[PDB]
Design a protein around this nucleic acid. Structure first.
Lengths: 64, 37, 143, 201, 117
RNA sequence: UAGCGGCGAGCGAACGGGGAGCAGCCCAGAGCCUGAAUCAGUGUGUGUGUUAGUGGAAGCGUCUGGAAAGGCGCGCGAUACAGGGUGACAGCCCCGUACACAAAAAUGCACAUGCUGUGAGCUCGAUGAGUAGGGCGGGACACGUGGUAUCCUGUCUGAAUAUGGGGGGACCAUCCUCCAAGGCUAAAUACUCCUGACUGACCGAUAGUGAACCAGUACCGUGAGGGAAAGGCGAAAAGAACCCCGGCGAGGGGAGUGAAAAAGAACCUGAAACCGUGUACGUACAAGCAGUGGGAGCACGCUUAGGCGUGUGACUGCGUACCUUUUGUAUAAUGGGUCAGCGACUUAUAUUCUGUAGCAAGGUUAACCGAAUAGGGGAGCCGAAGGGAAACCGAGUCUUAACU
């Protein structure tokens, strides 16, 4: 066989220039009027997947 | 003799009897289990 | 001399053989510890499985869409276009030089190093820095 | 570089990159092991527990016989039982890169020149298709174990070497690493030398 | 390439059973018991290459203590005496002189009492 | 990959590219015109193949040996040194192999040809209706009804018919492309009950078929069904005339054959467990993982007594098996009566890292063609450029009205 991508991980991480993975932050979909604008403004840019989790991500995304 | 010995070792391989150990051996294991409860 | 040929030094590494003896290092448990799901034949959990905690690829939101149009755009360096056989660059003349691909409809002439010959670029988008680099080394860009 | 002809006493001008480079023993070993691996017809199969001719009936009850628990008479622990990791017919071919194959031929040709195992004759043909004539001809040239290689495959030479054990006649196209290394002397026709340089660039 | 394993297994078993000649019963006949006997003999042999140094030393001390008390001084006072007399004869040799040469041992006791006083 | 997906687990295309192979036609329909290509069915002739076959090279002496093909010495064949047998290992002893030939008869294939059937070609016309589409239910499409195109239809309906209709992924318009509701069609392709030849870093009798042997047998089961074990004397039976013990036995001892009968049919080799006979030593006042360290004596061999070696081992210090599981086992926790044979980290394909080898801003081909492990084949893949959700920009880019 040929390795299948964990497909719902491809919709959530995207590869960068030096091999790290970017992802959208959690907590910014609903319940929102209770949150400060400082939280929400700091959750909008995309973020790098941390060191702990790259193992999991590279396992799920073997072609990206 | 060898054929009769293989089949007559094969006698109690698919048994059901619960009061007899291994299908055939008489015991008191009903009273032992029953008294343990 | 077929019994004097010999491989390099370091090329043929041995190969772990598990389950043979005490001296070998990997006997009884073969290097897989005591009981558990991981010491079992077939045993192991699936990918992105954190016990039952919601996995990383599933507690983070999904973003974006796929373009359809970025799969037919390309990106031409300046190291090529001395490779086009002609000194004239269109989408064909690049396809013919095995440099973009047949499905490609759009192309772009990024500064990525060292054009020398005078090249006439036709119908391709050219970046700013590479417009200066094509026009500086003779060259011509029309569209 | 020049190759001294045996009979004409000329010198054939060759490439130093083809007939005068170093012996890369690791490269040659990879191409030799790969050639020999390509020859393996890998035809075999043992029967797994699934293919052994039996039944899936469980031989005794799971509990109560004092026997160890067993489930199939085709277990690999049982006599008559089915190999655990039974083999299948497999392909043993290795990829050799083209530049590694050509590199290996350049190394072995350079060592056949360097060890005086390479003889260059101008012409090498036999009169009639007789093994007696080729036996006498190789006897006159002090050659017993030999790989004749000719740029144009003569029919009579091919029929004359077909019974001789140590002797093998090839065209310049179909040479392999294991025969240049296998045979004691290689006798190339000058035309074969030119074709070899065209092959190996 | 099926490898039968009869000949080499026979050689290993035989190696172990030759190392167990003289053992009682199965310990010299059956492989599965002679293997344990041979190993346990190995562990004891290790352990006892250390104990023979301890056992010989306590034997020698008992003989020097006997012969020295025969010459009117204890072992403790005799070794203190000879160390103060700066005699470095070890006690294998003092035990051996104390058996074979009674007069030399008497003279050693005189050095010990001479320095000890 | 795009997508589908309790957007989970998973499922997973097409476009387009490279190859293998390549072939188009007929009816719905009349007239002109006929046998015009076409195939099908048969006869005959030729060629080739199958079903029996034929010829097929070239050696002797001497030594060991039961026997020579082996050793040594000297010759010959080879388009033939593939293989098998022959009293040990044979190119030249035998069967064969290379090579060259062979069919009265029956046949397969391919041309040619006779007859029958069949219809070419031209002009004009027609150009598939309960159908396409729709509503409801379901299914197939990678696509789970979703914004879902498309196909199939169980049910209810229902057109236009070349100034027409289908598709182009909801849908409309413009544009492009194609002609459903009739049918036939070789090759590339898949498979091996069965036959022949050849091959194996496949097995060698607990393996390989369940089955090397009168094996799907014996045997088990009412039945469907399940399903064994079991090969090897010798080169040749020359397989033991005859005599003795013995029950006109069994078994044996001689004799004889044989190179060898502890090669005798219970037959090559002949292990281990297990059981004996004989010899040396120890052992009947001594407590326990049975050894180990020390160690007297005795018996055999030596040995220019050198005071060693082998066997035994009184007595003595120390010493509670192995496995497994465990915080922890002499544990009175698990497992094992013993021996012998078998018995468990493999294989394939992807991806990542390390070693190593080639080439290097390049590396490499896949299918396939194939003088065929060569060489072609660069379709493609990976890398040399990133940023952004994306358009887009590009050594920058995104954010933001703009960024210290």
């Amino acid at each position: 066989p040929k390795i299948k991508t964990v497909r719902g991980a491809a919709k959530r991480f995207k590869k960068t220039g030096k091999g790290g993975f970017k992802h959208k932050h959690a907590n910014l979909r609903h319940i929102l009027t209770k949150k400060a604008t400082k939280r929400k403004r700091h959750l909008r840019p995309k973020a790098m997947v941390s060191k702990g989790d790259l193992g999991l991500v590279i396992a799920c995304l073997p072609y990206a | 003799m060898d054929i009769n010995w293989r089949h007559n070792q094969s006698t109690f391989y698919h048994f059901t009897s619960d009061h007899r150990i291994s299908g055939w051996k008489e015991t008191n294991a009903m009273y032992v289990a029953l008294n343990s409860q | 001399r077929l019994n004097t040929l010999s491989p390099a030094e370091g090329s043929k590494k041995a190969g772990k053989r598990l389950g043979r003896g005490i001296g070998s290092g990997l006997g009884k448990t073969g290097g897989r510890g005591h009981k558990g799901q991981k010491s079992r034949s077939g045993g192991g959990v699936r990918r992105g499985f954190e016990g039952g905690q919601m996995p990383l690829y599933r507690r983070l939101p999904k973003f974006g869409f796929t373009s359809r149009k970025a799969a037919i755009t390309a990106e031409i360096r300046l190291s090529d276009l001395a490779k086009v056989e002609g000194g004239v660059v269109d989408l064909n003349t690049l396809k013919a030089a095995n440099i973009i691909g047949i499905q490609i409809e759009f192309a772009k002439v990024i500064l990525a190093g060292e054009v020398t010959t005078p090249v006439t670029v036709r119908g391709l988008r050219v970046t700013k820095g590479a417009r200066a680099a094509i026009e500086a080394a003779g060259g011509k860009i029309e569209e | 570089m020049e190759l001294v002809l045996k009979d004409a006493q000329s010198a054939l001008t060759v490439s130093e990159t083809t007939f005068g480079r170093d012996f890369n023993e690791a490269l040659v070993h990879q191409v030799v092991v790969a050639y020999a691996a390509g020859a393996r017809q890998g035809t075999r199969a043992q029967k797994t527990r699934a293919e052994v001719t039996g039944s899936g009936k469980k031989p005794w009850r799971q509990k109560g016989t004092g026997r160890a628990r067993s489930g199939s008479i085709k277990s690999p622990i049982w006599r008559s039982g089915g190999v655990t990791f039974a083999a299948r017919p497999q392909d043993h071919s290795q990829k050799v890169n083209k530049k590694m194959y050509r590199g290996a031929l350049k190394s072995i040709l350079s060592e056949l020149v360097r060890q005086d195992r390479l003889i260059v004759v101008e012409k090498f043909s036999v009169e009639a298709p007789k093994t007696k004539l080729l036996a006498q001809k190789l006897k006159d040239m002090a050659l017993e174990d030999v790989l004749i290689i000719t740029g144009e495959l003569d029919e009579n030479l091919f029929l004359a070497a077909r019974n001789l054990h140590k002797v093998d006649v090839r065209d310049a196209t179909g040479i392999d690493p294991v025969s240049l290394i296998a045979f004691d002397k290689v006798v190339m026709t000058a035309d074969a030398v030119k074709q070899v340089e065209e092959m190996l660039a | 390439a099926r490898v039968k394993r009869g000949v080499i297994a026979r050689a290993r078993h035989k190696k172990i059973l030759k190392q167990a000649k003289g053992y009682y019963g199965a310990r010299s006949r059956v492989y599965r018991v002679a293997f344990q006997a041979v190993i346990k003999a190995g562990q004891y042999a290790y352990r006892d290459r250390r104990q023979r140094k301890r056992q010989f030393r306590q034997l020698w001390i008992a003989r020097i203590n006997a012969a020295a008390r025969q010459n009117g001084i204890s072992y403790s006072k005799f070794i203190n005496g000879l160390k103060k007399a700066s005699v470095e004869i070890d006690r294998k040799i003092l035990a051996d002189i104390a058996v074979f040469d009674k007069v030399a041992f008497t003279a050693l006791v005189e050095k010990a009492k001479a320095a000890l006083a």
